[PDB]
C-alpha cells in the first residue's frame, strides 16, 4: 500500500517562526496532494490543494510545493492559531491515504516533570481491583517515558496513560499513568515503583512506596 510519511512527526516553535514541514509518498502521486490544519476538537481544514495551490480564504502565511514523491508545507511567521496538527493527503491512488501528521507546539525552556506516586485506596480494594497512579506534572517537552515496577518486576500491558493539552500560560504538559492490578496481586507484593524518563532529567527518577510501610 502507498505510504505517506510526514516529517518531523512533532515540532516545537514560537510565534513569528518560519517552519516548513514535509510529506513523502512511497510512489509518485503527481500533484495530487493536499495539506490540512486541524485544531483540537475541530475537523481538518484545507490549506493547500493540488500540491501548491493556496485554498481560497486561507492566509498568505501558508504555501506548499512539490511533486512526485516530495512535498512541503511552509508557514511564514507562525501565528498563535497555527499551533496544531497538520496532515497531508494523496488523492492520486485509491485509497486516498493521509500522512501520520505533524504536531506543532509552543516551544519553551526544558522543564522536568514533578513526579508523584499514589497507592490504591482501601475503599477501591474492596472492589477487587487496585489502581496505582503516577503523576508527571508540568513538564516540557511532551515526550516522556513511564515504567512501572512491582518488586523489581517490569509491568507490561496493565497500564494506561493520558496527557493534557499544552498549558496556555505555562506551555507545559502533565501526564497520568495508571497501573491496574487485582487486589490479590497487590497484596502479594510490597514495592511499587514509577520510573520516569524525560529530557529534563539527567537520569531517570523513581518514585515508590511500600504497600506495608
Amino acid at each position: 500500500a502507498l505510504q505517506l510519511t510526514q516529517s518531523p512527526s512533532s515540532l516545537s516553535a514560537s510565534v513569528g517562526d518560519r517552519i516548513t514541514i514535509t510529506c513523502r509518498a512511497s510512489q509518485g502521486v503527481t500533484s495530487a496532494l493536499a495539506w490540512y490544519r486541524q485544531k483540537p476538537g475541530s475537523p481538518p481544514q484545507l490549506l493547500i490543494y493540488d500540491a501548491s495551490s493556496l485554498e481560497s480564504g486561507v492566509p498568505s502565511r501558508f504555501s506548499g510545493s512539490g511533486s512526485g514523491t516530495e512535498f512541503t508545507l511552509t508557514i511564514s511567521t507562525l501565528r498563535p492559531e497555527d499551533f496544531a496538527t497538520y496532515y497531508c493527503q494523496q488523492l492520486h491512488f485509491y485509497p486516498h491515504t493521509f500522512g501520520g501528521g505533524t504536531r506543532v507546539d509552543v516551544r519553551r525552556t526544558v522543564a522536568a516533570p514533578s513526579v508523584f506516586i499514589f497507592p490504591p485506596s482501601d475503599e477501591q480494594l474492596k472492589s477487587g481491583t487496585a489502581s496505582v497512579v503516577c503523576l508527571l506534572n508540568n513538564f516540557y517537552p511532551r515526550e516522556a517515558k513511564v515504567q512501572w515496577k512491582v518488586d523489581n518486576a517490569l509491568q507490561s500491558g496493565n497500564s494506561q496513560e493520558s496527557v493534557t493539552e499544552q498549558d496556555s500560560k505555562d506551555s507545559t504538559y502533565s501526564l497520568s499513568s495508571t497501573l491496574t492490578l487485582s487486589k490479590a496481586d497487590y497484596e502479594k507484593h510490597k514495592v511499587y515503583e514509577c520510573e520516569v524518563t524525560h529530557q529534563g532529567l539527567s537520569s531517570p527518577v523513581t518514585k515508590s512506596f511500600n504497600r506495608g510501610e
Binding site: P44, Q89, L91, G101, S131, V163, L175, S176, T178
Partner: protein
C-alpha cells in the same frame, strides 16, 4: 455555501453495525465528478480514509476495510450513508464526511462536516466510583481523585466547589478494556496547607444523574 453534517447513534455495541448519514447542502451529488467521502479519527491517532462515492454512483473503499464498509447515496434527499459492520472498540472515533470538487481543485477534500463521535462499547449507563489520590519552607504536594468505571462520557470535575482552579489538571479519560471509562483529576498545592486547608473533588456524571463529593486528605 457548502455544508455537511454527520448523524447517527453515538453509541454502538461491540458486534453490532454502525450506520452513519451525511446530510449536505450547497451542492448536489448529481453534479459532475463531485464526491462525498468519509474519514475517521480515533481520539488517539491520525486521520484514516474510509471511502468515497461520486455522482456516477462509483464507489471506492479502504482495501483493509472493504468487506466491512458499504457506502450509498440518495439524490432525492442529498444524503450519503456509510455502513460499517462487525465493529469493535478499535472503531471508536470521530467520523467526518467531506466534499470533493469536480474536474485543479479536485485534489483535496475542501469542505468537511463537524464530525460525529462514535463510541463502541457493550457497556450500559453507569455512574463512576470516586477514589482518593492522597498526598503527603519547602512545598507543593500533589493530590487528586480517581473517577473510575463510568459510562458514557462525559463527566465533570471541579475542586472545592470551583473555589480551587489554580494547579488543577483533569486528564482526558481512557476507555478501559472493560468498556468503562476512567479518568483522574489532580491539583498541586502547598505542602503547608495540607494540615489546615480541606480538598474535595466535585464529580458529576450527568448521563447517570450521579454526583459525588470526595474529600481527599493524607
Amino acid at each position: 455555501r457548502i455544508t455537511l453534517k454527520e448523524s447517527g447513534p453515538p453509541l454502538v455495541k461491540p458486534t453490532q453495525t454502525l450506520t452513519l448519514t451525511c446530510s449536505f447542502s450547497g451542492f448536489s451529488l448529481s453534479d459532475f465528478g463531485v464526491g462525498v467521502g468519509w474519514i475517521r479519527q480515533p481520539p488517539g491517532k491520525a486521520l484514516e480514509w474510509l471511502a468515497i462515492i461520486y455522482s456516477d454512483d462509483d464507489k471506492r473503499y479502504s482495501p483493509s476495510l472493504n468487506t466491512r464498509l458499504t457506502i450509498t447515496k440518495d439524490t432525492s434527499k442529498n444524503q450519503v450513508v456509510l455502513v460499517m459492520t462487525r465493529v469493535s472498540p478499535v472503531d471508536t472515533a470521530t467520523y467526518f464526511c467531506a466534499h470533493r470538487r469536480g474536474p485543479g481543485p479536485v485534489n483535496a477534500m475542501d469542505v468537511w462536516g463537524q464530525g460525529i463521535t462514535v463510541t463502541i462499547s457493550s457497556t450500559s449507563t453507569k455512574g463512576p466510583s470516586v477514589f482518593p489520590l492522597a498526598p503527603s519552607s519547602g512545598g507543593t504536594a500533589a493530590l487528586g481523585c480517581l473517577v473510575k468505571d463510568y459510562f458514557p462520557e462525559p463527566v465533570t470535575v471541579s475542586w472545592n466547589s470551583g473555589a480551587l482552579t489554580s494547579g488543577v489538571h483533569t486528564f482526558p479519560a481512557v476507555l478501559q478494556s472493560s468498556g468503562l471509562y476512567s479518568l483522574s483529576s489532580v491539583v498541586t498545592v502547598p505542602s503547608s496547607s495540607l494540615g489546615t486547608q480541606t480538598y474535595t473533588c466535585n464529580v458529576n456524571h450527568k448521563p447517570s444523574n450521579t454526583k459525588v463529593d470526595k474529600r481527599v486528605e493524607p
